[PDB]
Ligand binder design. Sequence first.
Ligand SMILES: *[C@@H]1O[C@H](CO)[C@@H](O)[C@H](O)[C@H]1NC(C)=O
Lengths: 24, 49
Amino acid sequence: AYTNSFTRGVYYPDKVFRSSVLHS
Amino acid sequence: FQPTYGVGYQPYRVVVLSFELLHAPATVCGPKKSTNLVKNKCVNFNFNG
Ligand SMILES: *[C@@H]1O[C@H](CO)[C@@H](O)[C@H](O)[C@H]1NC(C)=O
């Protein structure tokens, strides 16, 4: 069987702190 | 491996030091004599290289 994942499975891509930024 | 082989056929030991030289916390480190810390002044610094 199946279901919708929504937004799930994002992770911190590198061990660097960043704040107030839209990193890509 | 025969001791009488030509040099290109003799055994060589090989070691390959692979570095995770990343933004992660350090645990293998150069033999540098660390200093006391200074703040609010303009200073040179070296944190983990
Ligand atoms: C994906 O989810 C929908 C809704 O539950 C379903 O119709 C479909 O069969 C599911 N599987 C695949 C492989 O699309």
